[PDB]
């Protein structure tokens, strides 16, 4: 752990808890500084605001309270802090794509593109547009882990700190030696205030309660459209340096391994790793052709899946009873491995739906 820069004092609370992983914390803070300490195609307020009407989908106080601070260290007319309706037309038209983006991805189509580079008197141009929806998905996926790992506002964490195991270690030593459709569709469909004036539609979520019955997003075949050889290279064409800083930072999580399992050393733990990752992805729609979603519930403990899908879907409803409740006998460190595997995996998915929706109106 980078230790010094964590007890120092001299960085907030979120990044102290990154510095648990020094492969990850790299790679999280290139990208965030780019984002929001680097010229690029928009200001400086404006990254800050948009970062705001993000955090708001989630009445994330940690995030909007910091965007704030710096919007208003930055320039930034204190007036937008009022409410969106104060904030200038190119930037209201985001709230549709914040919400699909944050709750219901797989709903962003290429009319809604349209709206965005619709030519009017101040008009979204793709490069912009690429950065904001690289700063939507950058702080959702940063809402979850604030409240994933019970981030306090500036102990840095009000849930980590400065047997069965085995059984689990067994299921994947045998693991590691059609109907598929209908695996992944069983565990698709399983069921488990003054920020309020940057958003539009609060009660927009994850969970549609105006149909009966759990959400089940609509199965998207991954390979339709990945980011390894899709949604990549269209990022690196429309926004050069935030694509290779996001490659970067997908590998960084998706491969993070100290190849130990709780008291463990000496293990592979890229199966249950996978899981993790697969089963996220499939709470937003993605089934991957090879994959046998069956050993989701074989790997992963219903503590973590509910954990793991409230921190998705509902991070302003996770409590410290849910973090302590799952993986009883494993260290804080995994539990925080956890969070960031997720967040890399659900941002992964919003945007790979938003750039699909970007490729299908080019066309
Ligand atoms: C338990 C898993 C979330 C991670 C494990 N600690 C590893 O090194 O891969």
């Known amino acids: 752990g980078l230790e010094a820069l964590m007890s120092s004092g001299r960085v907030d609370n979120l990044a102290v808890v990154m510095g648990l992983h020094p492969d990850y914390f790299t790679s999280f803070w290139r990208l965030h500084y780019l984002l929001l300490h680097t010229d690029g195609p928009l200001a400086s307020s404006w990254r800050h605001y948009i970062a705001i009407m993000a955090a708001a989908r989630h009445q994330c106080s940690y995030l909007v309270g910091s965007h704030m601070a710096?919007?208003?260290?930055?320039?930034?007319?204190?007036?937008?802090?009022?409410?969106?309706?104060?904030?200038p037309e190119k930037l209201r038209k985001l709230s549709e794509i914040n919400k699909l983006l944050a709750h219901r991805p797989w709903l962003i189509t290429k009319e809604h593109i349209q709206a965005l580079l619709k030519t009017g008197e101040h008009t979204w141009s793709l490069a912009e547009l690429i950065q904001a929806l690289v700063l939507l998905t950058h702080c959702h996926s940063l809402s979850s882990f604030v409240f994933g790992c019970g981030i306090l506002p500036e102990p840095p964490s009000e849930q980590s700190s400065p047997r069965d195991v085995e059984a689990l270690m067994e299921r994947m030593q045998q693991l590691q030696e059609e109907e598929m459709e209908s695996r992944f569709?069983?565990?698709?469909?399983?069921?488990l205030p003054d920020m309020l004036c940057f958003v539009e539609d609060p009660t927009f979520?994850?969970?549609?309660?105006?149909?009966?019955?759990?959400?089940?997003?609509?199965?998207?075949?991954?390979?339709?459209?990945?980011?390894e050889d899709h949604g990549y290279s269209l990022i690196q064409r429309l926004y050069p340096e935030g694509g290779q800083l996001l490659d970067?930072?997908?590998?960084?999580?998706?491969?993070?391994?100290?190849?130990?399992?709780?008291?463990?050393?000496?293990?592979?733990?890229?199966?249950?790793?996978?899981?993790?990752?697969?089963?996220?992805?499939?709470?937003?729609?993605?089934?991957?052709?090879?994959?046998?979603?069956?050993?989701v519930n074989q790997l992963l403990e219903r503590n973590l899946k509910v954990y793991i899908k409230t921190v998705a879907c509902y991070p302003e409803k996770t409590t410290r009873r849910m973090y302590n409740l799952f993986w009883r006998h494993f260290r804080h460190s995994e539990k925080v491995h956890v969070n960031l595997l997720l967040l890399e995996a659900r941002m992964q998915a919003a945007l790979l739906y938003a750039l699909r929706a970007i490729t299908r109106y080019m066309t």
């Not at 710096?70 to 904030?87: C, K, S, V």
């Not at 590998?251 to 709780?262: D, R, V, W």
């Open 185 to 191: 569709e069983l565990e698709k469909s399983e069921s």
């Open 70 to 87: 710096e919007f208003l260290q930055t320039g930034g007319d204190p007036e937008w802090l009022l409410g969106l309706h104060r904030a």
């Open 205 to 227: 979520g994850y969970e549609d309660f105006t149909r009966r019955g759990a959400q089940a997003p609509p199965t998207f075949r991954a390979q339709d459209y990945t980011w």
């Open 248 to 295: 970067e930072k997908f590998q960084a999580a998706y491969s993070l391994t100290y190849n130990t399992i709780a008291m463990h050393s000496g293990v592979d733990t890229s199966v249950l790793r996978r899981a993790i990752w697969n089963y996220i992805h499939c709470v937003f729609g993605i089934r991957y052709d090879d994959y046998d979603y069956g050993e």
